[PDB]
Amino acid sequence: MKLEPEAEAEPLDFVVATEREFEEVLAISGGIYGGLDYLPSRYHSWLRDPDRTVVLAKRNGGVIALESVNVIDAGETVLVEGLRVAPWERGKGVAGLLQRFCSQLVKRQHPGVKVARLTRDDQLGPRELKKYRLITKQGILLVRFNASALLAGLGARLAALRTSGTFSPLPTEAVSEAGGDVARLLLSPSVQRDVLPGGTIIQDWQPYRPSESNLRLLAAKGLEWRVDSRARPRVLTLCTRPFPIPHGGDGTWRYLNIDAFGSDGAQVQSQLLWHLQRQAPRLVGLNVMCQLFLEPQLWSQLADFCQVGLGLELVKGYTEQYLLEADIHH
Ligand SMILES: CC(C)(COP(=O)(O)OP(=O)(O)OC[C@H]1O[C@@H](n2cnc3c(N)ncnc32)[C@H](O)[C@@H]1OP(=O)(O)O)[C@@H](O)C(=O)NCCC(=O)NCCS
Ligand SMILES: CCCCCCCCCCCCCC(=O)N[C@@H](Cc1cnc[nH]1)C(=O)O
């Protein structure tokens, strides 16, 4: 005897998101990432991405879940983002059904995609470690501060650290994307082997293989870069322009994401400081969640520098960003 497919009293309808559903999507997104959800600020931009499909699950005509798929890596990879189910619909298998629908959609619409990729900060259990390959992992440092408070006291803090011999910023070098410097770094095999984590660029949780096609995607985002030495690169940092996040409920918070690649902690310190100096003036009057992704063995050094040296508040303890990959057809 076979198992008969059983019907649901209220079947799910899967549809492509439009701008009209924005408010219903916010209504399912309360509390996500403790207020660091990017989707409020990014939803409308997602609707314009030519290789992205944003899928909504609906029950009785109302949105109850969302998942985005975006084809990258010259057609070989689908990046899965934003998976969420309304709190009043969780624990029923909705995320599973949505994932199953998006898997069918990708295979139908993008038959050349070979792998799925995603980033994830929850601990990998047996089931998870069985289904995915771990490409790489970065440590996550999350600190917060009032930008005007940082601006007022930073100079004096730096002077105290210099006078005491505790810290003086090491020289860093300019990186111009328009002038070709980013391509020279990211298309270098030695940079890919020795600097990038798992040979991968991670930018604001989004993984990219280091290729010309992906560099075009990065160049449209207005990133800022810094390096220790263009001639002999060992530490490369990438700052994503800050954007509003729902934390605090009051509109005063911005999210500043910095990805750091390489093993020299002193250079990560000096480059972090450079990015903070570049970004903080435009953030006067606002509050900042600053999240730095870096090689794990540097976390403690950077946490101390941020807290004690720079007077920023540590939001939480150590966690990790996992980059995971699975074959599409198994
Ligand atoms: C994560 C989230 C989307 C799950 O939605 P859900 O409908 O409750 O998940 P399901 O009921 O289908 O599955 C529950 C369990 O099944 C397990 N599971 C195993 N395989 C699964 C699969 N293919 N699909 C779904 N769940 C699976 C998971 O371990 C999951 O664990 P959990 O109870 O801790 O969530 C939901 O908790 C949420 O919206 N969180 C806020 C946003 C967020 O954190 N998203 C994840 C970012 S990577
Ligand atoms: C389903 C299609 C077939 C492929 C099979 C793979 C299934 C993967 C399921 C879900 C993966 C989770 C994706 C996600 O949500 N990543 C976070 C990262 C993040 C950003 N800021 C904080 N965290 C995000 O984009 O929000």
DSSP category for residue 32: G
DSSP category for residue 308: I
Nearest-CA neighbor of 84 among 104, 70, 98? Answer: 98
Q: Contact, 138 vs 202, CB < 8 A?
A: yes
Ligand lying closest to the C-alpha of residue 323? 2
Q: What beta strand segments (E) does the chain contain? A: 13-16, 52-59, 62-72, 77-85, 115-120, 133-146, 173-175, 201-203, 206-208, 224-227, 236-244, 253-261, 287-294, 313-314, 319-327
Nearest-CA neighbor of 145 among 255, 246, 37, 225? Answer: 255
Please list the residues that pair with 208 across neighbouring strands: 201
* Pocket residue to mutate for ligand 2, from 68, 202, 205, 257, most atoms within 8 A of Cβ: 205
Please list the residues that pair with 294 across neighbouring strands: 139
State the virtual CA torsion across 289, 290, 291, 292 in degrees, nearest 10.
-170
Ramachandran angles phi, psi of 209, nearest 5°:
-65, 140
- For residue 75 the two structure tokens come to 């057609």
Residue 307 Cβ < 6 Å to ligand 1:
no
Block residue for tokens 């983002």: 81
Helix or strand or coil: residue 318? coil
Taking phi first (over 0 means left), then psi (-120 to 50 degrees means alpha), and beta for anything else, what does residue 165 get?
left
Ligand 2 first shell, C-beta below 6 A: 33, 80-83, 99, 102-103, 106, 116, 118-120, 205, 326
End-to-end CA distance of the chain: 27
Helix or strand or coil: residue 126? helix
Residue 113: other Cβ atoms inside 10 A: 19
Residue with the nearest Cα to atom 22 of ligand 1?
A: 96
How close is the Cα of 219 to the center of ligand 2, in Å? 23
Determined by which method? X-ray
Domains and CATH numbers, the chain: 13-113 (3.40.630.30), 137-322 (3.40.630)
Taking phi first (over 0 means left), then psi (-120 to 50 degrees means alpha), and beta for anything else, what does residue 215 get?
alpha
Between 147-163 and 265-279, two packed helices, what is the crossing angle to 10 degrees?
Answer: 140
Helix or strand or coil: residue 215? helix
* Pocket residue to mutate for ligand 2, from 14, 46, 78, 80, most atoms within 8 A of Cβ: 80
State the virtual CA torsion across 61, 62, 64, 69 in degrees, nearest 10.
70
CA distance 115 to 122: 21
Taking phi first (over 0 means left), then psi (-120 to 50 degrees means alpha), and beta for anything else, what does residue 91 get?
left
- For residue 156 the two structure tokens come to 């004096």
Q: Contact, 241 vs 254, CB < 8 A?
A: no
Contacts of 221 (CB under 8 A, 6+ apart): 203, 240, 241
Ramachandran angles phi, psi of 146, nearest 5°:
-85, 125
Q: What beta strand segments (E) does 215-318 contain? A: 224-227, 236-244, 253-261, 287-294, 313-314
Declared resolution, Å: 1.5
How close is the Cα of 252 to the center of ligand 1, in Å? 30
Going by their DSSP bridges, the two strands 115-120 and 77-85 should be labelled as parallel
Block residue for tokens 């006291």: 153
What is the Cβ-side half-sphere exposure of residue 96, based on CA atoms within 13 angstroms? 4
